[PDB]
Design an enzyme around this catalytic site. Structure first.
Site, PDB file in Angstrom:
ATOM      1  N   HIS A   1      43.613  43.287  50.928  1.00  0.00           N
ATOM      2  CA  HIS A   1      44.657  44.236  51.289  1.00  0.00           C
ATOM      3  C   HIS A   1      44.068  45.325  52.182  1.00  0.00           C
ATOM      4  CE1 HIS A   1      45.992  42.464  47.451  1.00  0.00           C
ATOM      5  NE2 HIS A   1      47.230  42.672  47.863  1.00  0.00           N
TER       6      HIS A   1
ATOM      7  N   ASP B   1      41.979  47.923  50.233  1.00  0.00           N
ATOM      8  CA  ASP B   1      40.651  47.409  49.905  1.00  0.00           C
ATOM      9  C   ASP B   1      39.596  47.906  50.882  1.00  0.00           C
ATOM     10  OD1 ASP B   1      41.671  45.760  47.775  1.00  0.00           O
ATOM     11  OD2 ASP B   1      42.220  44.252  49.263  1.00  0.00           O
TER      12      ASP B   1
ATOM     13  N   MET C   1      42.868  34.981  55.603  1.00  0.00           N
ATOM     14  CA  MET C   1      44.156  35.574  55.268  1.00  0.00           C
ATOM     15  C   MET C   1      43.975  37.064  55.012  1.00  0.00           C
ATOM     16  SD  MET C   1      45.785  36.965  52.310  1.00  0.00           S
ATOM     17  CE  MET C   1      45.846  36.142  50.725  1.00  0.00           C
TER      18      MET C   1
ATOM     19  N   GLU D   1      55.030  35.734  49.210  1.00  0.00           N
ATOM     20  CA  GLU D   1      54.534  35.380  47.885  1.00  0.00           C
ATOM     21  C   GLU D   1      55.523  35.851  46.831  1.00  0.00           C
ATOM     22  OE1 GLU D   1      50.544  36.251  46.992  1.00  0.00           O
ATOM     23  OE2 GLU D   1      50.761  35.878  44.850  1.00  0.00           O
TER      24      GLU D   1
ATOM     25  N   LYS E   1      57.191  36.349  42.854  1.00  0.00           N
ATOM     26  CA  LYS E   1      56.831  36.607  41.464  1.00  0.00           C
ATOM     27  C   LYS E   1      58.086  37.124  40.766  1.00  0.00           C
ATOM     28  CE  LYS E   1      53.184  39.018  38.832  1.00  0.00           C
ATOM     29  NZ  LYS E   1      52.305  40.228  38.894  1.00  0.00           N
TER      30      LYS E   1
ATOM     31  N   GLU F   1      51.701  30.976  43.847  1.00  0.00           N
ATOM     32  CA  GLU F   1      50.638  31.191  42.868  1.00  0.00           C
ATOM     33  C   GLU F   1      50.972  30.471  41.571  1.00  0.00           C
ATOM     34  OE1 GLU F   1      48.467  34.971  42.487  1.00  0.00           O
ATOM     35  OE2 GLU F   1      48.955  34.887  40.348  1.00  0.00           O
TER      36      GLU F   1
ATOM     37  N   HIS G   1      52.282  32.771  38.869  1.00  0.00           N
ATOM     38  CA  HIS G   1      53.585  33.381  39.127  1.00  0.00           C
ATOM     39  C   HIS G   1      54.745  32.454  38.797  1.00  0.00           C
ATOM     40  CE1 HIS G   1      51.973  36.604  42.165  1.00  0.00           C
ATOM     41  NE2 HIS G   1      51.541  36.783  40.930  1.00  0.00           N
TER      42      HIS G   1
ATOM     43  N   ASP H   1      47.577  30.077  46.038  1.00  0.00           N
ATOM     44  CA  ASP H   1      46.759  30.930  45.183  1.00  0.00           C
ATOM     45  C   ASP H   1      46.437  30.192  43.893  1.00  0.00           C
ATOM     46  OD1 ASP H   1      46.556  32.961  46.943  1.00  0.00           O
ATOM     47  OD2 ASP H   1      47.746  34.412  45.811  1.00  0.00           O
TER      48      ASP H   1
ATOM     49  N   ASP I   1      51.366  38.771  33.667  1.00  0.00           N
ATOM     50  CA  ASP I   1      50.551  37.989  34.584  1.00  0.00           C
ATOM     51  C   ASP I   1      49.084  38.103  34.194  1.00  0.00           C
ATOM     52  OD1 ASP I   1      50.214  36.284  36.734  1.00  0.00           O
ATOM     53  OD2 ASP I   1      50.019  37.901  38.181  1.00  0.00           O
TER      54      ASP I   1
ATOM     55  N   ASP J   1      46.450  36.070  35.077  1.00  0.00           N
ATOM     56  CA  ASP J   1      45.575  35.864  36.227  1.00  0.00           C
ATOM     57  C   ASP J   1      44.207  35.358  35.779  1.00  0.00           C
ATOM     58  OD1 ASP J   1      47.662  36.607  37.680  1.00  0.00           O
ATOM     59  OD2 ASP J   1      46.917  38.575  38.299  1.00  0.00           O
TER      60      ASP J   1
ATOM     61  N   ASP K   1      43.093  33.927  43.549  1.00  0.00           N
ATOM     62  CA  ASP K   1      43.639  35.233  43.205  1.00  0.00           C
ATOM     63  C   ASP K   1      43.586  35.319  41.681  1.00  0.00           C
ATOM     64  OD1 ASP K   1      45.013  37.625  43.039  1.00  0.00           O
ATOM     65  OD2 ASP K   1      46.680  36.972  44.300  1.00  0.00           O
TER      66      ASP K   1
HETATM   67 MG   LIG Z   1      48.860  36.375  43.570  1.00  0.00          MG
HETATM   68 MG   LIG Z   2      47.477  37.933  40.507  1.00  0.00          MG
END
Ligand SMILES: [Mg+2]
Ligand SMILES: [Mg+2]
Ligand SMILES: [Mg+2]
Ligand SMILES: [Mg+2]
Ligand SMILES: [Mg+2]
Ligand SMILES: [Mg+2]
Ligand SMILES: [Mg+2]
Ligand SMILES: [Mg+2]
Lengths: 384, 384, 384, 384
Positions: free
Chosen positions: D52, D55, D86, D179, D181, D215, D218, D243, D253, D255, D285
């Site tokens: 991002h 970041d 990406m 993306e 979710k 993802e 997700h 992802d 989530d 992850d 991710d």
């Molecule tokens: Mg993700």
């Molecule tokens: Mg995530």
């Protein structure tokens, strides 16, 4: 991975014999004969069968039709060397149970629900079953006003009290196991998790008479970790039986073959019984999917048997590798078994290394190292 | 619908004072002063407050900073006429609790977790709280191997045993209430439902010392009927406290205001406490959404208070209409309160009207009439 | 709250006539006659009926038995003044559909599945239906290998292409509406949400021929906000029909009466159709619970009708109060309707008040004031 | 199972560098330096990173602090041979996005949300990224009245239209990937499933510019089969990125690392990309659990990489065994690839073997043989 009768694998007559009729569609296989279901399981390697009371004898049969059915079934038991370790009552299929049996509103129904349970207790003791599983499938409601729960918790206990009195007076050496399920067929059912069932048991006049029959799929329906339900049960001495199948999450009770659904859950579960010494019957309560014919049927239970025999191998291999045995010690799994304060309340309270001189920043930085363990059981489970 | 202090409505310092920091974003309001949170609730009509031990005094404060904070807070209590009926420990926010407190793997942490609980028991007894709520928010795991549950059920009981010994020796007249939650922050947490919590309690050396603090949202997260959990608790004499909020189904703990989420569930719940005689503090554990400012905050708890006062009205009106009172008798809600077999096991078994001469087709045709009732409570709830 | 035929309320023959047979138990009511189901709905205030092709004519009936059934049904339509606005095909109950119809693996089945759809298109055009609902209830799988989805998305489109060619050549003035459902009877079904269904439609050779038939319960089964699915549909001009019932969360499709399940969702939904101008048939696809008799049946659909008429009142009252109309403006619901950048990309990019001279701290402090609104619709919904 | 850069494995700066701060507790690791996160991944075998815009450069940094950060990061890219395929925008962490960016109510915020996206498009094109992922994490609502969806679907498209115009005018050779979710951080979010995202895309003025970034976790949050979402995407040519992680069902989530959560789903997924020819970057991710230190961190992503390399092996072995290749033909997986009616509508309709002379009982008895296949992939997955 050939199952031996010494594995104590049981199946149910109802599970292989399910005709494939679902809430939306018709039955894709014809009805089996309980004789033919017995011979066949003894040629795959299974150890026993289990039945509801409408399985073996059709509902309403005359007492001479009853015994002939019992005589045939027995002759098969004598022609396979297979036992009947658990038996159970069908309290859900007849429309007179539409609102339950033991918790049905009407008074006249509850008495009948009790009489139809006792009459099958005498059959299962004659065929020698050591366990007697009870699933209130119709106990619960669809609407907040229909069932006053405190009364409904009063009539359950009653009937399970009466069941405990009937067995004490007769000299029967058998134990009950309640089987929970959170919903379906009812939108909610009473005593939903394994934990709720343990709570209800301690309130019966004879607490040493009742355990729980848990099912993999029934607890995963509420999003609940099953090898974690299976530890609480062992921890209070109340794992009398267990039902083995598979389930893909919160939804209608799929009742897949053991091995499907969640495989890591089936792994950690077989790990837990083998390392804690469960000596009961590995029972498969499942449903061969309705798409299959009879050849798909018998392949399906061979799976059940064959998948358990693989995890028990990967489970033992995981627990015998001295790199794991070190890996356990690095997460401090050994201190989790030692007492927190065996020196006593007063010592704890006097110990300045536990509060005033305690280094909270040097403790919080110690890494639990959980992710290198979980991959070693990942390595041990996939065999790579 | 103006709440009076005689309604015994309590709020928590942490709930109105939540700064709006979420797992993904930053805090949209500034920190309140506990003095300002006390005065304000007394101008809406609330009856008390409740706090964790890090609320009132910041973590690590020196003993003179501790008492000054206690003196201010007290002076406010003396400047509003408001009480503190329940108090609780923060065992979850400091990184030294990342794996729990009472069930944390490390031994040195568990002792500290116990010492930081007892030190707040002495504060809450001084400020006169009658209840002491305990939420193991960090007890549980994310991975099947990280927590051996039977050991983890052994160290819980220990610490709750020690808590019961500390209060007996001191002469404190206070009771514990465990608060369950199935997951979040942990992916699974121990003692997940209200039923699991009742099960754990009966195994402590002094069972008359511990109840359950349930929460509307915590049980609806597992898809579980809350006014049904609230009856089992009353049925074993173990509803010591209750947390009032709202929740839209199985997902992250939203902690909406009481009235939101499921309104019919909030209806049938207020019905059940009022008609069973619950005399405890109506506590709101909730979170004013982070979009709002301070004006949105104080409107939010006014809602909590104002929504309960409406259902209690619609609940009583539903129970006073002689068309409902007839409607109850037509579903046979009265026979559900009568015993199934007060005449005794032997009479039941001798009664031929309960089995052999029982008309199963004429019983099964009797209509339970549940859907005209449910609309009369629909009519009573919407007032149409 | 007496429904008038000008409300355009339709019911289905299958919904009132459901015999109460569930996945676990038998049917608690006897089969209705479609003639008797037609007269009766016209004495409650309904406006039409809808049927699958196995409803009106039994499967396999000879062509003279077919027309006699059609003649009776018609005579009733002429004896009540009631219409048939929508019709649909039963592709799920016969065991030849166990793996689907249009997506069934076998080639010979798919052709038959198409022929049995077209033959009912000619009946529904004769009885004058303007909509033709298609629910692939058997399309999907239980196992990751059984259905290659890309092929299965290729054969769907095909058959729905062929359906669009059959209607163009004939001169029929009718439109299709796909009905989604995420699972049950299949463990997963294809095109699960309303959004998936919109995606599939845009890929057919004639996109102006197909809409979506959504159902309250089908989307709430996946934990999805229904008045939010109902806006995306209106936003792309693809709300052709809608199914009204109630559902308590993620679980087996309960199909409760409209009004039950989630009442605030049923509120915000009736709000959205009335204020956006939906002119289609308010159809109830539901199931009177199997506990009831026939008297409980007819009370049940009277509910459906009576609950919609109440929310439409509370919905309009909410939208007419000038304190709400101010309350909308304080959350800035009006700026949400104005364009973000009508001045154009270049102006936006040149505008220094949108980036370089933008006060991010004075914007972030502006309160959205959502919680005083939500209580005014709380006040408007409970009428207090 | 040593990953090579030719596997094209990417990780995100944010994923390894997650500091372990959760909705309830504080961060258990210190902040990494993006330089140190780059060198390290090149010593495990990874192929690129993704970031991002907050970041790489801290929010609000001055333009000379911006370039120095870019110069350092670049020098690392030149010191590892690693790419940045990406890139993405942080539209969720600052409190000015509390109600979204592109769909935020306020007008002045939406313009800023667009300007902060374009400014990072120019950075990612300079660092050479071929994909540009967009996750409206703050788009949606918690209350039915707060977000009018049709307007909110109007402002999304706008901004994604403007993004497509900015890239066409500049000569940039890059594509967007939305993306989805379903919820968290918001209680509901817009465009929830992969299917909803495909629907929204077809309505943009340039449909060949936007794909989907899906993802694993997700979609499993809504109880949805992921290798089934991954086929619909390939079937409309819209799998631009993917992802890789793990998730245990419907809940917050988690992850987890790719390999955890659902292992059979991760199996059937790796099967589907390899056999359909996906040539994009295998991006992880995920979140190394907060209990671990830095040593637990780097072991975690080594897992991600090592688990994919195992399934790709078991996936190919499953697809090369001529006993499976026969097993596929016995379920008739080949006829599922042949057309249903290549001979044309008229021939179908004239074909009497498809309706009038069709043997529905001899077809319905043919067994699909799905359960012996599923065990051969069970055998192939566990290697037994
Ligand atoms: Mg993700
Ligand atoms: Mg995530
Ligand atoms: Mg079962
Ligand atoms: Mg079972
Ligand atoms: Mg809370
Ligand atoms: Mg709480
Ligand atoms: Mg339905
Ligand atoms: Mg429907």
């Amino acid at each position: 991975y050939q199952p031996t009768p010494e594995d104590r694998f049981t199946f149910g007559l109802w599970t292989v014999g399910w005709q494939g009729r679902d809430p939306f569609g018709d039955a894709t296989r014809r009805a089996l004969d309980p004789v033919e279901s017995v011979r066949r399981l003894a040629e795959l390697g299974a150890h026993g069968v289990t039945f509801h009371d409408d399985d073996l004898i059709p509902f309403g049969s005359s007492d001479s039709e009853r015994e002939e059915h019992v005589k045939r079934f027995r002759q098969a038991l004598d022609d396979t060397g297979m036992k009947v370790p658990m038996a159970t009552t069908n309290l859900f299929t007849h429309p007179v149970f539409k609102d339950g049996g033991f918790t049905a509103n009407d008074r006249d129904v509850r008495r009948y629900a009790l009489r139809k349970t006792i009459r099958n207790i005498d059959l299962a003791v004659e065929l020698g079953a050591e366990t007697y599983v009870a699933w209130g499938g119709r106990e619960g409601a669809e609407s907040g006003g229909a069932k006053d729960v405190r009364d409904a918790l009063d009539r359950m206990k009653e009937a399970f009290d009466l069941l405990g009195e009937y067995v004490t007076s007769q000299g029967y050496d058998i134990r009950f196991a309640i089987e929970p399920k959170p919903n379906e067929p009812r939108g909610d059912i009473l005593l939903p998790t394994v934990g709720h069932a343990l709570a209800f048991i301690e309130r019966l006049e004879r607490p040493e008479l009742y355990g729980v029959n848990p099912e993999v799929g029934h607890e995963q329906m509420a999003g609940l970790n099953f090898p974690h339900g299976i530890a609480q049960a062992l921890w209070a001495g109340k794992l009398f039986h267990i039902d083995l199948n598979g389930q893909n999450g919160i939804k209608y009770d799929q009742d897949l073959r053991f091995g499907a659904g969640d495989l890591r859950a089936a792994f950690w579960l077989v790990d837990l019984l083998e390392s804690a010494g469960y000596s009961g019957p590995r029972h498969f309560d499942f449903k061969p999917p309705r798409t299959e014919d009879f050849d798909g049927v018998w392949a399906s239970a061979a799976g059940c048997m064959r998948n358990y025999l693989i995890l028990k191998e990967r489970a033992a291999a995981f627990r015998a590798d001295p790199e794991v045995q070190e890996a356990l010690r690095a997460s401090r799994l050994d201190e989790l078994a030692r007492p927190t304060a065996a020196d006593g309340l007063q010592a704890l309270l006097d110990d300045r290394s536990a509060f005033e001189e305690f280094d909270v920043d040097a403790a919080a930085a110690r890494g639990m190292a959980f992710e290198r363990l979980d991959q070693l059981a990942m390595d041990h489970l996939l065999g790579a």
